[PDB]
Every structure is written in structure tokens, then in C-alpha cells.
Amino acid sequence: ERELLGITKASLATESFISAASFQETTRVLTEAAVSGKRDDLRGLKENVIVGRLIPAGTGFAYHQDRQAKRAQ
Amino acid sequence: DLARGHLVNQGEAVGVIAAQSIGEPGTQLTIQ
Amino acid sequence: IGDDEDSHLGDFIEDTTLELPLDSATATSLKAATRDVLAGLTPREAKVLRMRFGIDMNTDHTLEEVGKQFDVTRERIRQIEAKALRKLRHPSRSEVLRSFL
Amino acid sequence: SVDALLDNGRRGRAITGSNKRPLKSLADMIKGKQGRFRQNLLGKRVDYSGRSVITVGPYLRLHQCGLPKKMALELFKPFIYSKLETRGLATTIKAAKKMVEREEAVVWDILDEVIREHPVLLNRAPTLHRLGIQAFEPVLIEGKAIQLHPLVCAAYNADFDGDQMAVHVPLTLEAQLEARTLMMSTNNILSPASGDPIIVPSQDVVLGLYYMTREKINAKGEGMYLTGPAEAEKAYRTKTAELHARVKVRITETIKHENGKLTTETKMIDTTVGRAMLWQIVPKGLPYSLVNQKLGKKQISNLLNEAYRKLGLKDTVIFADQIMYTGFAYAALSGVSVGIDDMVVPAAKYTEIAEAEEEVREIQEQFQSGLVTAGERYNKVIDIWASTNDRVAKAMMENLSSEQVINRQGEQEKQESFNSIYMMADSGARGSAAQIRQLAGMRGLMARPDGSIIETPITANFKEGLNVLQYFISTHGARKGLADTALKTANSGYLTRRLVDVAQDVVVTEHDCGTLEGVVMTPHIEGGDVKVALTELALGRVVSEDILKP
Amino acid sequence: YSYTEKKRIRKDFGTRPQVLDIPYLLSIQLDSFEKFIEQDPEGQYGLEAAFRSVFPIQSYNGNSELQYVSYRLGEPVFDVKECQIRGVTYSKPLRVKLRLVIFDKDAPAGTVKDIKEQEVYMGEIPLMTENGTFVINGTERVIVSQLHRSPGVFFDSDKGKTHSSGKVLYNARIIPYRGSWLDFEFDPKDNLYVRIDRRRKLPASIILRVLGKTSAEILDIFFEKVNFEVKDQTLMMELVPERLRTFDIEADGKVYVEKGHIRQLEKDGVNFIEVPVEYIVGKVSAKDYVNEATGELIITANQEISLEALANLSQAGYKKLEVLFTNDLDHGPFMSETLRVDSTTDRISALVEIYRMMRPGEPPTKEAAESLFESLFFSAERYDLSTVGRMKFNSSIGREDAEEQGTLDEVDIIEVMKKLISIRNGKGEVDDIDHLGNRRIRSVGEMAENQFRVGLVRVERAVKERLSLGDLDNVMPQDLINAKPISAAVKEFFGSSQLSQFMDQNNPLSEVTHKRRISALGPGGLTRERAGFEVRDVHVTHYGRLCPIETPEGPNIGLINSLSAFARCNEYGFLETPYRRVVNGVVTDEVDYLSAIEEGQFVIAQANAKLTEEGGFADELVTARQKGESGLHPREHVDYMDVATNQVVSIAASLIPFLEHDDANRALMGANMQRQAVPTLRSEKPLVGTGIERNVAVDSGVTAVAKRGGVIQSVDASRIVVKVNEEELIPGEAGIDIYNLTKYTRSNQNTCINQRPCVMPGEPVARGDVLADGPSTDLGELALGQNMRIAFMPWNGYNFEDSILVSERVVQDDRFTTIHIQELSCVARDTKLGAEEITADIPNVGEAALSKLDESGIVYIGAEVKGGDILVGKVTPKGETQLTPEEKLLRAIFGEKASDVKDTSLRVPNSVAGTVIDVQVFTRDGVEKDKRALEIEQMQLKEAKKDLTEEFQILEGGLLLKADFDKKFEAKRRKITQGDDLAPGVLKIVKVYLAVKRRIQPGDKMAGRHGNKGVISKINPVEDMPYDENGQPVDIVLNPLGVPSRMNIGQILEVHLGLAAKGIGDKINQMIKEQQELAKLREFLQKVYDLGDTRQRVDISELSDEDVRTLAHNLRAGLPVATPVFDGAPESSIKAMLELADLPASGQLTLFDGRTGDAFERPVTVGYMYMLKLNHLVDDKMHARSTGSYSLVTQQPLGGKAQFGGQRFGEMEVWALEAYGAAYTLQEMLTVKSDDVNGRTKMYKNIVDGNHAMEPGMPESFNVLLKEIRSLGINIELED
RNA sequence: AAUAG
Ligand SMILES: [Mg+2]
């Protein structure tokens, strides 16, 4: 059954903990991620902005696609 | 793509555009 | 800082250990100019000066181990180093390096 | 102690230092608005950046911005060093530094050659949408203020009352090409929120285009036959005919159809001198009906929209530049000025005020007789004054909108007024009906700080001047408006940040996902009239199920 | 007319006579500090109050005590000017007489064994200057008054917005000056709860039980009793007639309605009622009923009576039962239900529960609980309901005693409880929190007294601790008092308080407005983010007290206010405003100052009301206001009138002409921007004014005002000597007055403070006459800006939006040229390597840069310097520096090597060119004075000699003597010669003052007085500007599009009146140039001054010929006119003035295009506007950086123009770049421009090589983040 | 804190 969440709750419940920590409620996000042992694949814009890489949109999009090929191979 | 007039291109960050489009006008906001 | 409340002192503290990019570019230019000047010298004198000043080498060397190269002669190595400095001091091949003073 | 080191204040009383304030722990290092994530990672201070006050450059082109020479010298310093070294003017980089510090003429020539085709990014805070950052070609100017093109101000929400802009220099080739291709002002002329043009002319431009395209009865040179726009301009420059003279002009009009057919027709059209002189700058492929009318803000918006839809982008940019030049020139030539005699107060205002006061006294008498209750008295007094305000506004607008002129036959004819305030409001340059109401009619009923309406209204305008009580009542609402703006700014900022966070991952990743699902779209009906048409909802959407004819 | 006013009489367009002059504008500061420092024999205010509050200090054992006798303030070490030069606080020493009285242990307690009287130094008290400012660390500062919540009791409600239903919940809050807070609130179950210092709620009855109140006593206090008897075997109600007005009623003679008006039957009067038992069944007992035989309690208090209970009391023989009155409308069981939910039954249990709620997790003991409860509210040491708090408390609860009490008691708490219950019932109303009768003004004196008392308590603790020891044979009072805590408290308040603000000093108006500023923030006030809409609003009580226009535009809106023109603070700190009495129907010139509470009762007419010759009102119905609501009122019901038409607005708003034609949103901007104007080279009066300019100029203190009248003996650009009149001499006085003028002194905003004489030798002067004009003053009138010829027309888009087009002539005449004085410092310190030396021996610098330096290495006075020029030369010792091998080879080739010291010198900042006007050298005591410092010392000694000799000569000439003058000169020599107390490690300081002439340029901000602000876009040539038929070009072209949508029409009226005034001035100039007869000049002047039906009667017949010539000379540049706010010049007067000057009545002329010569198609509004040059100059705002300093931890560029920092690319800019799709630009911003240490160096090298490619890496901030997350014991890592 | 947008 699909659920409707508010924008704040939806933002806090994303897959990546870097974006969720960067939004708000850093302590809760980091504690949950640490106990769970989460892994962030850096798929969105905020993670790549934080780590200094090209964002997977626009001029960087193709670049990221190429990497997804090399990991596939 | 409303800013370009044609079909949207691959790699366009449409979520950021949507959020900015909604958020920018927030200051203007208050049987016959 | 001052009458503010969202300011902090640590936000205004420089990193005095950093090297200016102008200085780094000047160092690279000096390396290139020194290499070009050394290229206009006899290979023996160039190698002797390189060992005696540590250019393109991990360590500097005194006259003894520079003599250990081919002929172990402190008085000879000293003479050839003096000759190399005299030729490099000639205005014909020193205008490039003069600009770095 | 370990709890205080990790997270101070979570366990209990926060440990404080000698400054009597809580010590900052590692959790405080990483978290919050002032934490590492938001202060240093999602935003940073950058090099090759500057800031200055912005003035207006009315001579600029849409892709140009006026940049100060000293500011450019500081921003483009490594580039100047590189070109001094390349062309042999400086032996080393220290010599180049000395030359730049001494400000030699050859340094200025090198700076021109550096900035020849190097785009530069202009930013104004708050950056509410992506049009808050745009790329321009810099033109070096003497001075300390950035010159900004007028037609982009609406995109920046920028006015010249003390605004400051930041400037950034894209360094690598990829950044330069991104500035030229994506962020350049000539690429961004449509609003990404709605698709409507964002470089629509405003204020003086509109006013000028309004003044040149108006029509006057029995003007000098009426009834003259003109070979074309050039001869209309010649007649205007020779004082043969006025701008507002009704003439017949031979017009050659090219129409570009949907299929691309280009049909050229020459014919004699009844128009004014100003309309033909304005036709002189209209690109080929548009009807003359777009110009053969008085041009307010809406009409110029329609002109630009049709130019974009039927001709493209380059023609639209050139047309916008020419429109803004012409509007500025003829707004200057008009001599439009505001004066105390431009605020015409109708003679019916005093009679209406007297009638309202008398009938209010009658209603008070009825209240003293117990016929009506206090709430009824309040309500009907308020309705009385609202009706009086509407009547006074109507009489004032009617008096201000028209004038009587003598035509060629000698009779009296009704003409639309050339009153400066009326022209400013009607053209859409600045002003509305309510503001003219306040200038020349009644200020009307005002509200208390809680929101209730005061029975007696301000029966004076700003031309006559208010007394002390009326001004105090006005301040009641002025303060409320200012406070509301100040607080809603923060509320809107928080909402926008939340939306950007929730939607930041949405990127167009494919072309077609191969789904048959879709949404049902119908005209929006909220009563007996359409709120919005199906065309406006469907413009730009891909059909999911075949549209069979009914 | 005074002489200064006679020199240039301003035409008055007002019509209403003024019965009250505007009082001194800086009274709110001076009166407060006088209350603080002046000795009070009654001991109610200031230092005496604080001393009597803390002293006597009693030892715990009883051995001895320290008693306060008196205090005095010593003589300052330095004067104000000397304190500003040296950089020290202007203050006076506090010396307090104390007696240590030691008692005798063997003798009975209270026997004076010994007394030791001595004077103790109790700190240094900062002093207020003659103008209401303080000098703290050499900086002029203003302490801003606070608008806070008055102490007392306030009754409020949640307005039905907390619980699910409406259920409007009522609360009462007792707030003291010092101590804990008391809260009584209702829950949605109609139970009363108490909170002490905002912690967990407790049932209210507890607070009664701790006071010794039994449950029966509680019920008696909070309820009325309905009684019952057993009369002749029948039930007996005691009838209360008022209550009666569901059963059959007794009194068979006068039977009332049975199970189905009251007054008619109650008229006869009976005392007997018979009722059913079911009427008893529901009631609740009022007393505890005991049986001696049984020994038990048959029925308890607050217990519902039952049938079995009735039977039990029947057997017990009790015949009378009283129960509580309880209704649903007028009376309520709230206290009974509260008693039911109360688990406490005795004083000890209540004390224990209060202790548990106070101090959880501590074992409760009886003594600790008792001490806690006594200390909370009934101890004078920890509780203080101040005199104002007590008065407001008593007025709220209707108590007419305990006027001097400062602590709560049983009566106070019970009355607050009863009033809250009454408000719940319906009788009474809640309090208005924003009412100015509930908000108090707290000024400098009160805050200083509070902090001084804090310091006194700090030292009292230690004094008691020492006196408890006992060994006091050799102890003197000055061995017991440590003044450092008190000094720390006062310096904390005067230098680091939020309300101690760096003084606004752009112009006189800025200073006056800053001193009359009231903040809701500060210690004990509100917070910007936490403040709501209601506090920011304009309350109806602000009329005549707080200006509704002047308030900051921004997040501070509504929280900072300006005192109104006639507003005043009463003795309790509540604002009051003056009103004229209306006695017997006539408006008397007697003035009563009314506060907000007193104002509501009366009906107060406005100053615009029409008046007759007898002093009464003309109209039968006049527009007045009552209870904050305006309306039409009968003439006979009017009790008061407003004294002035500018009573509601502040000084800055009072300076705006035609304010009544401006929208309040723009009047706000005009008032705010009048305070940012920068003084120019030549001060020019406003042609159109309001009449308040003289008041601001005189009461600001910038001018030099004659203390006594007389004849100006000597005038000079720096000194004015006045020969005093024979009637005003103190017997045996020299008879002269000397005024030394401030010449080119830096202000707090780096502007110029300069005083220029406006008197001639031999000119008579009276008291109060202006002798010299300070900055922004012209002949005693405030001159903030310049009068500019203005055309309202568009000009080719150069006045687009709010842009301003300015003629080149305005630049040529230096009409907006300003002088800015900037202070620069070179500090030579002591380092580990060695001592930094100030010298002209600067390595790697040629003789070109040493030309302006002297032998000592300091620039000459009068040296014209540009950016990068050396002002003070300094060399810092440097350590051994490693040389790269290439540098070693370069040294071997060319052997030069001189790197003992490093050039760390003071240089003129870039893009700054000016003249050195002053150099000051401070040397530490014990360090050699160089040649330059000796030269300055000799010059100062010679100047002191010369000034003293000249002053002595003039005073002895007036009188017509060695020891006193020798003493004065010796003191001056000691002050000049002695060393300077500098910061530790500082060897020498050299301060250089630079004067910079800033001319108007594109980018500068210019404004009028109506919110019409803008930025200059172009400096137009004179031949290109619009001109009239006479060839006169306009000076400034303004956009007409900014007038209608902003509803500031006062600017058009000002333009018209300025045109008229300049026309009349031109006519006067023509009459002077043609040398017409003085009779014609007199006739013209009288015609000008008789225009309109004004309140001004200027008679030129009473002016001498020389006076008329001077007046005509001062009217050459235009006739100054006064248009008061809400009493201004009507349009008919403006048109008449235009007609007199032979100008069009519409104010519109025919202009021609200077570029083509062609007439513009419509007439253009041309006139004169007063325009200002705001302190927002593009010189101070243009910044650019390519590469510079970086942060220590984040390795990011610093922030600020002072640090040569970079702009911040914030989150929203990143969002914009993401929306565009510019990934590479964003990566440039994140990595190679901010914190990629290797990448940014590689990028610089690539650009120098012309390659334009980047090799991005990891930002350092992310590495820092990883390190901190790891430091939190969390393994965060990167996987490949 | 204050100020500008
Ligand atoms: Mg602006």
C-alpha cells in the first residue's frame, strides 16, 4: 500500500544518508545509519556537491552514465 | 521544457526547477 | 567579533603557512630557467654544480663526494666550480636569471 | 565528560567555559545551520569573485554587462600575467606583477584582449530561481559600478536604489562554454515556471511605446498620405506631422504561416505616424495589427511573444533591444511629467461625502430609536461608506479618462485623456486604479491592528493631505504590511529549502519509459465559467491515449 | 527675534499658534544619569539606593558589621578630549565612607566595642558628557533606552486556541523586578494550578496550605455560604433575596412560583424558607463536623452531603448546616474541585511537595523546605517587587496599603487568585499586553544602578565570609572591599551590553535620533526571531508617545521606536504626553501631562480643531478621540486638546515637509534616510523646511552656543572670544568667554566634524546665539543636503527604475563633495626573535618610496599619498629561512643576501588617495622616544604655552596670579610628557590620519526626504541636459514614474514651493544688483512675509537698515520657507508664491533637449528639491579578488573587504547552477576556487600557462567532516 | 547587535 509523506519526512527518509544528514536532524540520521551500517552510492545532486564531484545532471550526466557502464562491465 | 520551448533533454534537473518555480512566488502569497 | 552574535573569531584567522600561488609559479619558472642555463654549460660543470647545490637531487653534496665522482680532488672540484660560476656570471647568459632577484 | 565532549547539553546542564557560554562539541561541529554540512560543504566562499553596486546601462545589448576596469583587472589577473608572458612584454611572472601593479597602458590592452570573449556570471541575492545567475559578455567601463541591462532586471528582481551584485569568472573551457550556451541571458528569455517571456519591457519603455502609438483628434498633418514608415519619420522630423496624427500609410507586410509560407502584401492602412515609425523596427513575418493600436504592457508582451513563436530567438533578441531603445528615446521626447494639477479631484466627491454623512446621521438616529441593533448599525454604515468610495472612484476615473477636443469640422469630440497619471496607469508602466484613487479620490476605510474596520473612513486624498488622526489610522495598516512581508520572507525561504531537498534527485534519465498510464485532463470548471482552458493545461504535454474526434 | 534668527528669517506657512515649545531633545538621557549619580538625601534613586540596599553587611555570627556612611566622586584623570586621544574611558573615581563596627562578645549583643571609619575606592564610574554620550575606550557610545514589561501582575488568556474546543483558558502571572515568577492557570477541567519559575504545575491549594490555610479557611475565603437550620421540625433556608431573582416555595402568605417576578414578592420581606432534602443532597459541605461522644468526623469539609450524612447529623443533634454557594454563571466550584485533586493535607506536606518540584532528586527535610519557601517570595534578598511593580500590582488587585512593600504576602496571593476566579466567572477583563500603561521605559540610570548593585552583592558575599572569621583587630574597611568585581560589572554594562551602542554620528540628526531611541530588545527584553506580530504593531496608546512612522525596515520592524516630539517619562517610567486643558468651553494654555491610563477617560480634541476669538470651539461637533477610538463628539464634552500638530511624530518625521501628502511606507524611508546623510564642504539650508531645523542644530550640541551675551571681541577660524555684558558677570570674573572650535576631527563613521565661525568682530550676541556652525549646520539651521534644480521627466533610460541623472556642473561646483578622515595604526611590538623597529631603513625599497618619510620613518604632515605608499616604516625580525637549491645557485651567481629583517610596514590602502593631516606617536614608559615623537612633544608644549599665554592675556585684559597658572601649566606638562599605558607587548604605536575628498560618481546613493532614493547612473555634460527658455539647464533629472505608485506627493509640492522660493530669491538678488532704493527692498520683503493668512507677523519696519541689508543678502540664494507637518502650506499659497516670483502657477516649464534643441512635447515639472548624499558610497562597496588569504581549518577564502575575501556561493546559487545544468562551473566553484589546495594551485599555474584546465580533487571541508565523524566514534570511510 | 538590498 503506497504511503503519502510530507516533504520533510520524505526528505528525511531518503536512501542516501549524506543528503538526509545535510538537510536536518543530523544526529538521528547519523545514529540510524551507523547502527544500520548504511552505504551511500552518491546518486543524487547533494552528495556529489558535497564530495566535489560532477553532479549527475546536465553536462555531468553523460559522465556518470559512463561510470555506470564501467561498473556494469 | 518551458524555459526552452522544446521537449526536455536528458539530464535536466527538473526537481530543482520545480522547487524553485513553486518557492519563488511565496513572497507574493498572503442554480440558474 | 565586535557587537555581532553570529560571528566568531575563528572565522577570521588566516593560514600563514600557505604558499602564495605567485611564489609557486615563480619557483617553477626559476627551475626552468636554471635548467636552461645549465644546458648551456659543459656536462661536467653542469653535473658538478648540480651535485654541489642539490638541483634535481635529494641531498646536497660537499666537495669530497663531488670529487668521488671521477677524480677525488677537492682543489680541482673547487676550481671547476669557480669556473662554472664565473661563466654563469657573464652578462651574456645571466639576464634570464637576473630577473628573479 | 565524554558525553559533554561528544554532545553538550543532551545529558543535562551544558558545560560552560570562562565566557559563561556552552562549549562547542563535535555534534555542534557537524550539525545545524552553522555546521559543516551547510556552512562549508553545501556552500562556500570562492575566489575570482567580486561585488559592486549596479547602475543602468541603456546602451547595452542583452548579452552585455558593464564591468569596471579595476574590478576586471583584479578578477582576470592570472590571465593578464599569462598574456604578458606570452607576448614578451614581461620576462617573468614577477615582472608581470609589477607591470599590473603600475597600471601601464599595455596592461589595459592585454585586459581588453583577455575579456574580449570571456563571459562573466552576475548574481543577485536572494537567488530565488535560476534566473538570479546569468552570464554576460563584459564591456569595460570607467567607474566603480556594474552596468546592468534593463530588460534583465525583472529576472533578477533588481532595481537601482542601492542594489549590489556579485560577479564570478568561469575559468576552464567547459565553464566558459556552459556560461555561453546555458546561462547566457539571450538563452534565458522564457520563464521556466510558466513558459511566458521574462524580458518583457517595463516602465519608461512601455510609456514611450504607449505615447508614440496613441491617437489624437485634429493633430497637425491629419489626413496625409504617406509612402511608408520612412516618410512618416521624415514628416515627424520636419515638424510636418505630429506623432499622433491620423494618416494613411502604404505598408508592406510579410506573413509567415504555420507551414512556412511567406506571403507579402502591400496596401494602404489607416494608422498614425508613430505606429509606422514603430513598424520600422518590427521584424519581417508579423502582422501590422500588432502595432496598429495603443501599446500598453500587454500589447508589447504580445508583440514579443509572437516574435518568439513565429520567428525564433535571434529575431526576438534584436527586436527586444530595438523596442527598448525606441521606448527610451520617445519617453524622453514625450516630456511626461507629474504635477499637482495632474491630480484632478472630481467635484462630485464633496457632494457624495455630504450625502453619506447625512445618511449616517439618519442611521444613528434610527439606532437611538431602537429600530436597529448596534451590529446592524455598524454593517450598514460600512456599506454606506464602501458605496460612497466606489462612486467617488468612478466619478474620478470618468473625469480623468476623457477630454473634449475640436475636430477639423469644428465640432466637439471626445478623446482619451493625455493626463500624465492616467497615461502611466493605463499603459501599465506604473500605477493602478486603486493608487490613483488614493491620490485623487478617497483613501477609504482602514483596519485596526486586529483586523476590524473603523466606521469613519479617511475622506481625504494625498493631494489634499490627511490630518493627524487619518495619518495614524494609515500607519496602523502600513506597519502590519511591513511586518507581514518581513516574516513571510523567512517562511517562504524555509518552504523553498524543503521543496528543493525533497525534489533534488529528480533528473530526466531516459526518453521513454514505455508506460501506458496517464492522467485525465479536463477544463477547470468551478461554477458557471471556465477558470482555465484545456489548451493552457495541455500545452507541452505528451498524449497518452489517442484523441478520437467526438 | 534673536540675532542669529534675524540674520535669515524663515517664512512660516503655519496657521496655529504654539503654546508649548519643543523641550530639550536629550532630556531622557541627562535626567536619568542625574538621577543615577546625584546624591539623594531620601535615598530612593541611584548609588545611594544601591548602597542602602546592600549595606549594612552583617557577619553570620554577630561579631561585627560594615556600615555605609556616604559616597563621593573624585576628579577625573583625563578630560573627554584627552580620553578620546589616549583611548581610555572618561570616568570618575567612586569613594565610599564605611565604618567597620566590631561588637563585644562578653557584653550583650549590640554593644559597640570599636569603630573603624575609612574611605574605600569602590571602582570607576563612567561619566556622561554634556550631550548625553559616554566615552568608553576612547569611543563615543550611546546607551539606548529599553521598553520592557512592567513588573506586577498581568491577567491573560489563550483566546481559545490551545484545547480542542474553545474553552478560553485564563492565567495570571506575577513578575517581579528581581525574583521568581508566579503563575496561576486554569486547565480545561476548571481546576487552578500554580507554577513557580515555569516548572511542573501543582494544584493551587498547595500555595494556600504553605501559608497556614486550612481547607475550611480556603472554602471560607473563596466561597459564600448558604445556611440551613432545623426550625420547628422543618428545614430552614436563610434567604438571601438577591440570589433567588424547580420546587415549591414556602412563605404561604407570599407563595412564589412552584416548580415553574421575584422582586414583587420579595418586597414584603421574610426570612423563612422551607426546602426539600433533595436540595441538600447535591450540595458540598463548608465545615468539618465532629462528635464528642463518637470522637470521629461525621462530615468533612469539601464533602458532598448525603442522606446518611443528614441522618447522622440528625442523631448527633446538629441543627444548622452550612454549604457552599455554587452556580454555573456567576459562581464556580473551581477551588473545591482544585481541593479535591490536591493530595496535600498539612503545611509540612505542601512544603515537601514544593521542595520536590523545586529540587528533584534531593531528600526533603523540613528546614530545607521552609528555607526554600521563605527565600522564593518573602525574602528581600532574593525577591523585589519594585515600587513601580508594587504600584501596578496594587492597582490591579485594588489594594490601598503596603505601598513600600517589595515582597508578596497572603493578601496579595489570595487577591490575585480571587481576581483570576472572577475573570473566569465573568466579572473583569484581561490585560492588554501591548498597552503603554503595561510597558515601561528603562534608561541609563536604572541599568547602571542594577549593574552596580550586582557588583555590590558580589563583594558583599566575600565581606561576610571574611567578617565571619573573627580576627578583625588589624582589619580596616579598605582591606575588606575588592573593587574589581564592581568595576567588572560596570565595564561589562558600559562596553559589552547590547544597549551600549557605537554612536551614530553621520550628522546631528543621527545623534539626536540615536539618543531618543527605544529598543524592545536587550537584557530582559524580546528577541528578533521570537517576537510576534502584535508587539510590532502600532497601538492606539502610541499617540503622542511613540512615533508610528520612524522604525527600522527589516527584521527589527516594530521592535525599535523613536520618542515623539513632546513625549516624556514620568517618575515610574511610563510615557506621558502633554495636553491643553479645556476649561468652561475655552481652550486654556495650561498643559497637563497625561499617561496612557489617564488618557483613556477623557475626550481629547485634535490640534486641527477650529477655534474662535474667545478660545472655544467653532463647530458644535468636534473630531476627538476617547478610549483609543476616534469620532465626533459634542463641544461641551471635550476635556483636552493636543498642544502641537507634530505631537505624534518624531523629530526626523517632523523634518519632512508636506508629510501629510506622503504614504507612511515612504515617510518611514524618508525619516530613516535623513539620518544617513553625509555633510558636504559647504552646508546649505533647505529652501523648504518645517521649522524644527534650529531645534535639532542647537540641541545636538554640534554648534557653539553663547553661554552669556556680550560683544564678540575676537573671531578666528579656531577661536571665538566674547566680551561679556556688564549685567551678567559673576562678581570678580575675568569677563570673557573663550570658545575653541573643533577643526577636522574624525567621526565614528569616518566623516568630518568641523566648526566654522558665523560671527564678525564687534557683533553683539545674546545668550543662546549660535557662534559657530557644526557639521550639517547653516547659521544655526540643520543643513543635511543641497538644493538641486530638478526636472521630472524620463531621459533616455538613465533614470530607469530609481536611477538618477546628474549634470556635470554639480560635480564641478563640488556640491556633494565630502571629506572623510580615516585613522591608520602601525604597532611596533616585541617578538621572541627581537623587537620590531620603526625606521626608514626598509629593505628592497628604493628612495622613491622614502621621499615622504622623515629620518624616524614616519610620513610628513601634509604629504599627498596614494595607494601603496609607505606611511610608517617598520621592520620585523625573521628567522632562518630554508632556500631552495635554485635559490642557492642564484645566490652563488649574484651574491646579494640581505634578509635579516622583513618589511611589515603601514601602507595606504589600495584605491585611497589623500593628505596626511595628523600623526600621533605613543611610546611605552621606558622606551626611547625617537626624533619625531620629541618633535611632536615640543610642538604640543609650545602650543600649550601659546594657548595659555593668549587666554591669560585676554582674561587679564578683561579683568583690568603666578602660582595658580604655574600649577595649571605644570599639570598640562605632566599630561603631555608622561608615557602611555599601552597593551602588553606593544612597544610603540603610530597613528596617521588621512583626509580624503570624495566626489559624486555613478554608484553613489542620493535621496530626498520623502523616501525617493536612488543611485546615480550617469554624469551628463551640461550641453546635453534639458534647459529652459532662459538657457538654464537643470541639475538633476528624476523619473516621474516613481511618484504615483509610491504615493509620496509631498515631493511634487516641495518642488513647486522650491521653485517659488528660488524665484523670490532671484527677485531679491536682482533688486540688490540694480541698487534700488532700500524703501523698495523693504516693501518687497514685507509683501513676501505677508503672503497668506499665517501665524507669523514679521515687521520690516522694526529692522534697521543694516539688518535689512543683511537679511536681503541672506535671501539672495532663495527664500527659506517653513511648512510644518499637518499645518503646511495649501496649494493656493504655493500658487500665490509662484505668481509673486513671476513663474507659472502649474509649476511646469517648457524644456528643450540640449542634444537637439527641440522642445519637449509637454511642460515639465521643474523646481528645487533638497537632496542628500547617503553614506552608501560605491568607493566603500566595490570589491574584487582573484586569490588571497585562506581559512586555517576549512582552507576556504576569508570573508570581507577588510580581509580581501571572496564572495559566498551559497546553497541557492548551487541550486541555480544545478537547475541550469552547469556541472563544470559548479565543480569549479566547489573545488578549485574554494578548498582544493592542490587543485587551486594547479589551476593558477595552468591559467598562467594559458591552458584553462582543472584537475579537481577532494575539498578539505569533506576531510574535516570525515575526521569529526570519526572522532564521534563512528567509522565513516570511502569505498572504491 | 546596527545598517543596505
Ligand atoms: Mg532595490
Side-chain angles (χ1 to χ4, degrees), chain E residues 803-935:
Chain E
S803 297
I804 297 178
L805 180 79
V806 175
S807 169
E808 223 194 24
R809 285 255 171 94
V810 186
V811 191
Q812 308 199 329
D813 324 284
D814 313 76
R815 303 211 60 189
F816 286 109
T817 299
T818 58
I819 309 171
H820 293 265
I821 312 175
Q822 162 174 12
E823 177 192 310
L824 299 145
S825 308
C826 183
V827 184
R829 274 166 180 120
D830 220 329
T831 55
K832 275 88 69 179
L833 293 166
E836 295 180 5
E837 183 195 356
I838 293 169
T839 186
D841 304 345
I842 302 299
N844 295 3
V845 169
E847 300 177 0
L850 280 35
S851 59
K852 299 165 191 177
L853 297 194
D854 66 344
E855 336 186 23
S856 313
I858 308 168
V859 74
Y860 288 107
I861 286 184
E864 268 258 23
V865 286
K866 62 184 177 305
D869 279 3
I870 298 170
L871 302 158
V872 194
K874 189 173 78 173
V875 285
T876 298
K878 65 185 290 184
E880 200 269 330
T881 48
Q882 303 197 340
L883 294 162
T884 77
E886 295 72 353
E887 275 166 19
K888 316 222 262 213
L889 181 58
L890 186 63
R891 182 181 63 83
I893 297 169
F894 320 99
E896 308 175 0
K897 187 191 186 177
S899 60
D900 295 357
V901 296
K902 162 174 37 43
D903 177 28
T904 88
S905 294
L906 180 71
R907 288 195 170 76
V908 189
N910 291 350
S911 290
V912 166
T915 308
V916 177
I917 61 170
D918 206 348
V919 163
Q920 295 180 342
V921 184
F922 306 85
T923 308
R924 207 233 298 151
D925 206 278
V927 189
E928 184 191 0
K929 281 195 188 187
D930 41 24
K931 301 177 57 99
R932 179 62 162 267
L934 289 168
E935 279 171 16

Side-chain angles (χ1 to χ4, degrees), chain E residues 77 135 168 249 307 441 506 527 589 621 693 707 724 770 808 877 894 910 942 951 957 981 985 1049 1098 1133:
Chain E
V77 194
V135 180
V168 182
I249 277 73
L307 295 172
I441 291 274
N506 286 305
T527 293
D589 292 4
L621 264 74
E693 288 90 27
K707 297 184 289 293
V724 188
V770 179
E808 223 194 24
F894 320 99
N910 291 350
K942 180 78 220 68
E951 286 183 337
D981 196 5
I1049 313 302
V1098 173
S1133 296

Side-chain angles (χ1 to χ4, degrees), chain E residues 1013-1088:
Chain E
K1013 61 196 166 176
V1015 165
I1016 297 185
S1017 47
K1018 186 177 175 65
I1019 306 284
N1020 220 17
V1022 64
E1023 68 256 16
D1024 294 5
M1025 296 258 309
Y1027 63 99
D1028 56 22
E1029 274 179 356
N1030 295 110
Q1032 223 189 331
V1034 292
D1035 285 358
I1036 288 165
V1037 183
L1038 291 179
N1039 208 19
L1041 276 171
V1043 193
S1045 67
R1046 282 138 177 196
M1047 296 144 297
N1048 45 6
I1049 313 302
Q1051 65 180 327
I1052 314 168
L1053 288 159
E1054 189 206 346
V1055 165
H1056 296 323
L1057 204 48
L1059 192 67
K1062 202 92 176 188
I1064 284 170
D1066 270 47
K1067 259 165 124 31
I1068 299 163
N1069 191 1
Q1070 225 201 13
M1071 308 210 345
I1072 301 190
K1073 267 186 329 293
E1074 316 185 344
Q1075 288 164 356
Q1076 293 181 39
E1077 312 172 3
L1078 206 61
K1080 260 118 82 163
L1081 193 56
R1082 284 184 180 256
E1083 178 182 0
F1084 188 60
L1085 285 180
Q1086 191 74 73
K1087 194 186 338 282
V1088 168

Side-chain angles (χ1 to χ4, degrees), chain A residues 8-26:
Chain A
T8 302
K9 274 166 73 23
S11 315
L12 284 173
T14 46
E15 277 299 278
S16 68
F17 71 93
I18 291 307
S19 70
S22 314
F23 178 46
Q24 70 190 9
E25 295 180 31
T26 310

Side-chain angles (χ1 to χ4, degrees), chain D residues 54 124 157-164, chain E residues 802 1013 1046:
Chain D
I54 48 153
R124 190 196 158 264
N157 197 14
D159 58 334
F160 310 104
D161 59 353
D163 283 13
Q164 288 172 236
Chain E
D802 294 57
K1013 61 196 166 176
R1046 282 138 177 196

